[model samples]
Target: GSSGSSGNDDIIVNWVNRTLSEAGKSTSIQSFKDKTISSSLAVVDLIDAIQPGCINYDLVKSGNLTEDDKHNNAKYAVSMARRIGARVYALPEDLVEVKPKMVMTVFACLMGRGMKRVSGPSSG
Candidate 1:
């Protein structure tokens, strides 16, 4: 079951630190804890941290994400988070009070289903 926690600072910090390292960037864990708050900053950081220039920061800052853009961004964010031992929620509202492990599990399952759809039915 997914539940919110007031003390998710540690989890967020840990995730940010690990992801940053995987992306070959270095920053204090405390810095991540101090700055990120489930906002655009976090999203931007997560995207860029995965691979530089992976996201158009200008478009993100413009707040003009199309439906397709949002879906693509969600896939990138969820996939990168999973790659670096973090988790993200499929729903924007759920992000306000994210349960990292639970969110990751759910997103992974959802992505798997999505892949199966894209790949179509298998031949026997």
Candidate 2:
């Protein structure tokens, strides 16, 4: 843990590492390229790492939420992640499989406010 300190740069670095690793292995959206997904996952993981369930909260685990509730939580999660210096991206339409669709939706919602979409090859 961070011991309730103001901040720890290492946590951000750790987030980047995990994000890139996951992106490299993700076969969900080939059109996005690895770094784009990495950037998106970085935001997702950062929010989850800090808040521990702000994105994938217990309500999701309970399986009681409607689809609308899931999307609402996801939008809220993206908004929160944006507050932490995270950027978002847009996945190609054809590449948006079910799982990737969820990931892309969370990220796509955050793509305003001067955030740029990542492109090019994987940095992993």
Candidate 3:
């Protein structure tokens, strides 16, 4: 009922955390605004979770990366998310800039498809 802890946001955010946690990835988001999103690691890992081995992780530069690295990862993330049929609408730069609302949309797109592909569930 409150403004900050809105219903849909809370559920979608939780949905992403558990999905990533199940995939054995070290990344998870506390909220859409979490600065770690700038690296696009979470989305990359999220896409990989949806389609294993689709990511080609050897190219994923973890630990330290320049802006190029982040943008590179974001581009790959968007491409893979779309390829996996998530209907992702967020731009690669959206992830690079760490925009909370835009960030949530990417994750939201992934999770809906994630549940369906993994046989977790979904709707029209």
Candidate with maximal TM-score = 3
Q: TM-score for each prediction?
A: 0.36, 0.32, 0.83
Q: Global lDDT for candidate 2?
A: 0.40
Tens-place lDDT digits, model 3, residues 74-103: 788888888888877678898888887688
Candidate 1 lDDT tens digits, 79-109:
5544544344355433333446444343333
Error (Å) of candidate 3 at residue 102 is 1.6
Position 67, candidate 1: lDDT: 49
RMSD in Å for model 2:
13.9
Model 1 clash pairs are none
Q: Is candidate 2 or candidate 3 better by TM-score?
A: 3
Model 2, 3-118: lDDT tens digits are: 67553333334434444354342212232233333323344443543445355534322233354444443444456665554464433221222244445344344333322345
Summed over model 3, clashes come to 0
With a 3 Å backbone cut-off (N, CA, C), the pairs that clash in candidate 2 are none
Q: Cα deviation in Å at residue 47, candidate 2?
A: 1.4
